[PDB]
Amino acid sequence: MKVILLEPLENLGDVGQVVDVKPGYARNYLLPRGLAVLATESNLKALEARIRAQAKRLAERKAEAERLKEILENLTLTIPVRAGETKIYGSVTAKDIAEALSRQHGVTIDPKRLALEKPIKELGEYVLTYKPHPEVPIQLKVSVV
Amino acid sequence: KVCEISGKRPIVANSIQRRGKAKREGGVGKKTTGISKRRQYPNLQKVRVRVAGQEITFRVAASHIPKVYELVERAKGLKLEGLSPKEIKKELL
Amino acid sequence: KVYTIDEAARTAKFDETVEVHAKLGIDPRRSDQNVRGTVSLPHGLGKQVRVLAIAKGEKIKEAEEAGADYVGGEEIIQKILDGWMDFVMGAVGSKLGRILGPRGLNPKAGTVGFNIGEIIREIKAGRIEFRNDKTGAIHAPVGKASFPPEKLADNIRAFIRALEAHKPEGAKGTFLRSVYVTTTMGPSVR
RNA sequence: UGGGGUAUCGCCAAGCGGUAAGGCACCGGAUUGUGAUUCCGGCUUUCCGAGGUUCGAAUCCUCGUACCCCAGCCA
RNA sequence: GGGGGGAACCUGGGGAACUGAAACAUCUCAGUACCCAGAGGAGAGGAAAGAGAAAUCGACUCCCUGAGUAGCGGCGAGCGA
RNA sequence: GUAGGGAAACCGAGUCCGAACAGGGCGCGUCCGCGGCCGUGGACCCGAAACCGGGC
RNA sequence: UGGUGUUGGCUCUUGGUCGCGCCUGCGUAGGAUAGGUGGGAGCCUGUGAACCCCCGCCUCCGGGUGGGGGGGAGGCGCCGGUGAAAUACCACCCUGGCGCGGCUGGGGGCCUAACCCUCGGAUGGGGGGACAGCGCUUGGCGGGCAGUUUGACUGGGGCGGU
RNA sequence: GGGCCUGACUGCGAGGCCUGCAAGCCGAGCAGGGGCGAAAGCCGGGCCUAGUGAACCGGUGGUCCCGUGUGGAAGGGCCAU
Ligand SMILES: [Mg+2]
Ligand SMILES: [Mg+2]
Ligand SMILES: [Mg+2]
Ligand SMILES: [Mg+2]
Ligand SMILES: [Mg+2]
Ligand SMILES: [Mg+2]
Ligand SMILES: [Mg+2]
Ligand SMILES: [Mg+2]
Ligand SMILES: [Mg+2]
Ligand SMILES: [Mg+2]
Ligand SMILES: [Mg+2]
Ligand SMILES: [Mg+2]
Ligand SMILES: [Mg+2]
Ligand SMILES: [Mg+2]
Ligand SMILES: [Mg+2]
Ligand SMILES: [Mg+2]
Ligand SMILES: [Mg+2]
Ligand SMILES: [Mg+2]
Ligand SMILES: [Mg+2]
Ligand SMILES: [Mg+2]
Ligand SMILES: [Mg+2]
Ligand SMILES: [Mg+2]
Ligand SMILES: [Mg+2]
Ligand SMILES: [Mg+2]
Ligand SMILES: [Mg+2]
Ligand SMILES: [Mg+2]
Ligand SMILES: [Mg+2]
Ligand SMILES: [Mg+2]
Ligand SMILES: [Mg+2]
Ligand SMILES: [Mg+2]
Ligand SMILES: [Mg+2]
Ligand SMILES: [Mg+2]
Ligand SMILES: [Mg+2]
Ligand SMILES: [Mg+2]
Ligand SMILES: [Mg+2]
Ligand SMILES: [Mg+2]
Ligand SMILES: [Mg+2]
Ligand SMILES: [Mg+2]
Ligand SMILES: [Mg+2]
Ligand SMILES: [Mg+2]
Fold it and tell me: The organism sits in which domain of life (chain A)?
């Protein structure tokens, strides 16, 4: 008997997948124990829902990333730092960079998964990254004056 | 007794007592030693089923058993309640 | 596959190793089977045919060039048969069961020849190109096949050994065959 | 009515494609008060019998015969 | 809205035996008597997943004929489109 | 009812069995009324011992 | 009482079938353990071989196969000979065999969640547990009940005889 | 007692014995294909009267036959047993 699973199962399964088992198992173990559900016509075209109501939701995050990687994986910025030769006195914690972008160019930053590690503090140019899936390794110049 | 879904119930029937060799084989014909009435039952069974918040069971034949677990479905979009298992089952078509 | 893909004949000493091996209804009840004498083979593939014209020592003059090469007589009977190191065939017609030289003393001696007034004719053939292979209690079939050099013109046993389907006295299914020896063995219907 | 099983030395009976194995039966011989049980040796061979298979077949296929079982009907 | 009742008629759910066969078990009597239920002035059934051989017909119901035909049958008694 | 033989297909005063063109086997009303007898039905009239159903 | 339904998980466990893969077959002569039959005069080694050692299984105690290491360019058939059958190696297929495999089966353990028993009233906890129970189906034991049969003649009826 | 044979026939049957019915029985001859005899002829089992069983139900051979729309089947019928 065809039935749609939920919380996966050793022996057979994985949310969504559809394997079939003897009426018994079904009706007396899976269906009452909320394990899996009937594979009706009903909840059939319905699994289509979450199969695409997530497949096309995930494609959004993937599509707001790669769509800010061809418009922001190529920008390098220029930082208004102050010091003199070697070290500064103001590293540049993420946010800083962001206030030098969210407002210096116009880009809301998520000041953490940006690839910046221990605060900078020294003149020169750098590269970082971002995002969880296809990222966006964006450089950045630390200046003077 | 009589299934509650399909409505099956005991039918009556005779049991034939033949003897002899069918003429489809050896031949000579085939005789009948004894008849007599008796009844065939519907293989009904019990089917307890959660639903709403109660239990409610069923006098259904293994034949229309699926149909039971099939109602519990089409009623998920219903307002079945009140301490009425007796009424739950009722409106459960 | 497709038909008789001779191509499978694709590797050593001149390709004349391909066979026709099959299998069928084991010697049922009383009767059985036995291929025919000198199955022509619509190719011929000039093989070393030894039509030993057991004639009266005269059909060695036109039996040497009409469908063979060398020939003997009633001398391989009791002069070259006395010793087992000097001795096919075609028995004397009429009333002469030549069962005094070839019978038992385990080879060829089943079908004879035709041309009492000369060991040939005015269109000499049907005596030099093939042979047979009777019924081996267990594994029957096993027939002679052709050689590499021809396309839709090499499969000469697909028509020959094939239609030889003229022994079916009363048995079962005669399938399970293929072709080739000193090589491999493919799979093609019939 | 189908389909099995056999019948081989004298009694019952082992039983592979290359060969006839045993006990018992009787006979000779040793021992025996006497007497079973002993202990050796044999004793007996168209293996039902007619075809074909095979280089040959008791031992394997067809066929015919006798009897043994199973199962099965009986106007 | 029901429950209860109504001469006979109706339909559905169950359902004998004497008897017949010149005894008796298939068979017959009989789906009758009779138990129960439902309906109504009637009930039933009714618009083809049909009939059956006609290049056909064209709900159902009921009467006459079809015909004691076809067939059924310890092919008996006898049952019957 | 004017057609009958034949298991039948089938032919026809014929026909069936038959190798036969021997034989032989089978080959010409209805509708009412009245009466006798017969069939199915309780079938001249009373009479069992009993069997079955549902009730008391 | 078999089968099937209500009946579900898990592991072990053997069959029977077909696939395929590797072995398998020791009369007397023959280099010996030769399965039939067909092709066949040339193949196998760097697509790393003869003696050797380790190691598994078969045994007709001689003989057989696969895996690995050493090693390094040889082997084996036509031949011949013998025998009814000859030969490498390439097939197709018999007798029995195992090995993974499809499809089916037979049993054995253990589980809970059907079902059943039950527990100061329980959406539960305990116990049995895939068995029992009940439906359909199969064959049987069955005067406990049920329908009926148990002939005629006949110096009365039975008994005897016909 | 011996030699050749198989009439221990197929088609049929005028005419009668018997006789409640059904059965039982005898039969000359004609046609077909035969046997023995030279021929006339004879032969459709047995010197002779006992050696047996209606129908129903089936089975095996045959065969012209029927064949559920038509073709073919299944299943029937007829002859034989
Ligand atoms: Mg009957
Ligand atoms: Mg079902
Ligand atoms: Mg003394
Ligand atoms: Mg017996
Ligand atoms: Mg009312
Ligand atoms: Mg009322
Ligand atoms: Mg009724
Ligand atoms: Mg009665
Ligand atoms: Mg009576
Ligand atoms: Mg009636
Ligand atoms: Mg009736
Ligand atoms: Mg009216
Ligand atoms: Mg009305
Ligand atoms: Mg209506
Ligand atoms: Mg019809
Ligand atoms: Mg019209
Ligand atoms: Mg209409
Ligand atoms: Mg009768
Ligand atoms: Mg009736
Ligand atoms: Mg030796
Ligand atoms: Mg020798
Ligand atoms: Mg347990
Ligand atoms: Mg439990
Ligand atoms: Mg409980
Ligand atoms: Mg059970
Ligand atoms: Mg009694
Ligand atoms: Mg009665
Ligand atoms: Mg009575
Ligand atoms: Mg009397
Ligand atoms: Mg008496
Ligand atoms: Mg005489
Ligand atoms: Mg008379
Ligand atoms: Mg006469
Ligand atoms: Mg004469
Ligand atoms: Mg004469
Ligand atoms: Mg006489
Ligand atoms: Mg009849
Ligand atoms: Mg018949
Ligand atoms: Mg029809
Ligand atoms: Mg038809």
Answer: Bacteria
* Phi, psi angle pair for B89, to nearest 5°: -55, -45
Residue C21 dihedral angles phi and psi, to the nearest 5°: -35, 140
Mutate to test the interface with B, among A30, A38, A44 (most CBs of B within 10 A): A38
Cβ of B19 near strand E (distance < 7 A): no
Q: CA-based angle B44:B50:B51, to the nearest 5?
A: 105
Contact between A42 and B73 using a beta-carbon 8 Å cutoff: yes
Residue B46 Cβ < 7 Å to strand D: no
**Terminus-to-terminus CA distance in chain C, angstroms?**
11
Does the CB of B12 fall within 7 Å of any strand E atom?
Answer: yes
The three-state secondary structure class of B21 is: coil
Inter-residue contact A6 to A13 (CB < 8 Å): no
Residue B52 CA to residue B79 CA, distance in Å, equals: 9
The alpha-helical segments, DSSP class H, found in C83-186 are 160-163
Residues of chain A contacting B73 with CB distance shorter than 8 Å: 38, 40, 42
SS (H, E, C) B22-72: CCCCCCCCEEEEECCEEEECCCEECCCCCCCCCCCCCCEECCCHHHHHCHH
Residue B33 to residues A55, B37, C57, Cα–Cα distance (Å): 72, 14, 88
Q: Which amino acid is at C120?
A: I
Q: What is the resolution of this structure in A?
A: 3.0
Angle at C42 between CA C40 and CA C47, to 5 degrees: 60
CA distance A123 to B85: 77
* Rounded CA–C1' distance between A24 and G43, in angstroms: 64
Amino acid at site A100: A
